[PDB]
């Protein structure tokens, strides 16, 4: 089977968009084969349906949506809405100058200040609960190898609610505006140090709102291999959060897969 696809670089965390038409039933299988082919994580494989974006696991994905906006600008500055998988409403998107793209991010259902015990120390954290995942923003003086091992041990040892497809441990150096993101998938007990779908960047915006009662506007969140901006603020509407980042096209072509 011939898959027509493009590979994108939203701030060092690469995505794939499939341009060729396929049965929605095949999407999970095609994405797994593209993941082996291209070394891109399945959650960051999207299908462009004929403006409509379907992620391989039917979830919302910020940096894949940002890649889709880049594709539309490149393929053919404005505000518009896109239909994306995992959303009840259309998603607000914007094209900005200098190949910056902005995407509305999932609304936090609740934030709770907490402490986590890792080794024999207590760490202040903000627990940010979304529909299908939870992030812990953990302020740090600096990210160390020791802290990374403690966070890995911590998530592995905890019993996690089945509500949460993923658990995020978002180590945030506030002064350096540096995020070291860890995504844990409880189902398959896998850990990956990557800001999957740019979700952690949005969580930093919510953290800033909670911590300072100050709106975020183009707040820079440095991470390994790039930078993403977060805007975050609205009475009974709750947290309104978007991320903004540069996307470049890495490659375009045809992949060859089985079936």
């Amino acid at each position: 089977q011939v898959i027509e696809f493009s590979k994108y670089n939203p701030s060092g965390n690469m995505t794939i968009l499939v341009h060729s038409k396929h049965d929605a039933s095949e999407y999970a299988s095609i994405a797994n084969q593209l993941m082996a082919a291209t070394h891109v994580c399945c959650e960051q494989v999207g299908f462009i349906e004929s403006f409509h974006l379907v992620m391989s696991g039917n979830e919302f994905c910020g940096n894949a949506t940002m890649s889709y906006i880049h594709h539309l600008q490149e393929s053919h500055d404005q505000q518009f809405k896109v239909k994306v998988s995992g959303c009840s409403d259309l998603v607000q998107c914007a094209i900005h100058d200098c190949q910056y793209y902005e995407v509305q991010m999932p609304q936090a259902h609740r934030v709770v200040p907490t402490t986590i015990n890792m080794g024999n120390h207590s760490w202040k954290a903000l627990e940010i609960i979304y529909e299908t995942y939870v992030h812990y923003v953990i302020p740090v003086k600096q990210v160390t190898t020791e802290i990374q091992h403690l966070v890995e041990a911590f998530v592995r040892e905890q019993q996690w609610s089945h509500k949460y497809k993923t658990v995020g441990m978002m180590l945030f150096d506030e002064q350096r505006q540096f995020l070291q993101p860890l995504i844990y998938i409880p189902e398959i007990q896998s850990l990956i140090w990557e800001n999957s779908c740019g979700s952690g960047t949005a969580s930093i915006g919510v953290f800033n709102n909670y911590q300072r009662n100050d709106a975020c506007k183009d707040f820079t969140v440095h991470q390994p291999g790039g930078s993403i901006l977060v805007t975050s603020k609205c009475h009974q509407l709750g947290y309104q959060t978007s991320i903004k980042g540069q996307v470049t096209t890495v490659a375009t072509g045809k992949a060859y897969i089985e079936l």
Side-chain angles (χ1 to χ4, degrees), residues 1-22 24-38 40-50 52-74 76 78-120 122-130 132-140 142-145 147-193 195-211 213 215-216 218-232 234-257:
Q1 187 181 22
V2 186
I3 313 302
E4 297 172 82
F5 78 96
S6 297
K7 197 182 210 169
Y8 300 95
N9 187 12
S11 308
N13 178 197
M14 288 193 293
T15 58
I16 284 167
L17 301 175
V18 175
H19 307 288
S20 43
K21 200 197 105 290
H22 318 273
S25 52
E26 298 163 34
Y27 283 6
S29 177
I30 294 165
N32 254 80
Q33 295 199 259
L34 288 174
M35 169 169 192
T38 68
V40 172
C41 55
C42 273
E43 55 199 323
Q44 292 183 350
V45 179
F47 296 82
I48 302 163
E49 282 184 22
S50 59
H52 187 206
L53 173 62
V54 179
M55 302 306 301
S56 60
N58 240 286
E59 221 81 23
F60 177 73
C61 185
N63 67 2
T65 307
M66 285 174 57
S67 300
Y68 178 50
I69 302 165
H70 173 65
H71 170 58
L72 293 173
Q73 184 222 72
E74 220 178 44
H76 78 57
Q78 91 180 228
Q79 296 266 355
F80 60 101
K81 291 204 185 184
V82 174
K83 183 175 172 53
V84 185
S85 58
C87 301
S88 53
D89 204 345
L90 302 191
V91 181
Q92 291 174 14
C93 299
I95 302 170
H96 294 281
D97 215 335
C98 309
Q99 297 202 17
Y100 279 85
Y101 306 100
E102 187 181 9
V103 183
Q104 180 175 38
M105 292 295 279
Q107 190 167 67
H109 289 7
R110 40 200 207 72
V111 326
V112 178
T114 192
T115 66
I116 53 171
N117 306 312
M118 296 193 289
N120 301 118
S122 277
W123 309 71
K124 284 195 189 174
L126 191 63
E127 177 182 81
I128 309 175
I129 291 165
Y130 302 89
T132 67
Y133 64 97
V134 59
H135 286 175
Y136 296 88
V137 182
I138 308 162
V140 290
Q142 56 170 26
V143 181
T144 76
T145 288
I147 297 174
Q148 295 192 276
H149 286 279
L150 282 172
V151 170
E152 285 178 353
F154 181 81
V155 300
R156 278 203 191 281
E157 291 167 13
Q158 296 320 119
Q159 309 255 288
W160 293 108
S161 172
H162 289 199
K163 179 185 180 177
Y164 307 135
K165 287 197 168 76
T166 60
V167 176
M169 303 290 284
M170 298 297 145
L171 294 166
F172 185 52
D173 183 331
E174 291 175 282
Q175 293 296 93
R176 302 200 176 83
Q177 293 181 223
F178 184 72
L179 172 60
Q180 187 78 242
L182 171 153
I183 300 294
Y184 182 57
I185 313 172
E187 273 178 66
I188 61 190
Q189 299 108 83
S190 51
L191 302 174
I192 47 140
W193 289 92
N195 186 18
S196 151
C197 283
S199 292
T201 304
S203 288
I204 296 305
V206 169
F207 175 79
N208 287 335
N209 292 161
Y210 174 77
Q211 278 293 277
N213 288 136
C216 264
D218 296 317
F219 181 86
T220 300
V221 183
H222 300 298
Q223 62 181 46
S227 301
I228 308 168
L229 311 176
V230 63
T231 294
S232 195
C234 297
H235 301 304
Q236 87 299 339
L237 301 180
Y239 292 95
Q240 302 299 316
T241 311
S242 70
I243 58 167
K244 187 188 302 182
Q246 286 189 310
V247 186
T248 57
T249 311
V250 172
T252 193
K254 297 186 168 191
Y256 308 103
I257 58 153

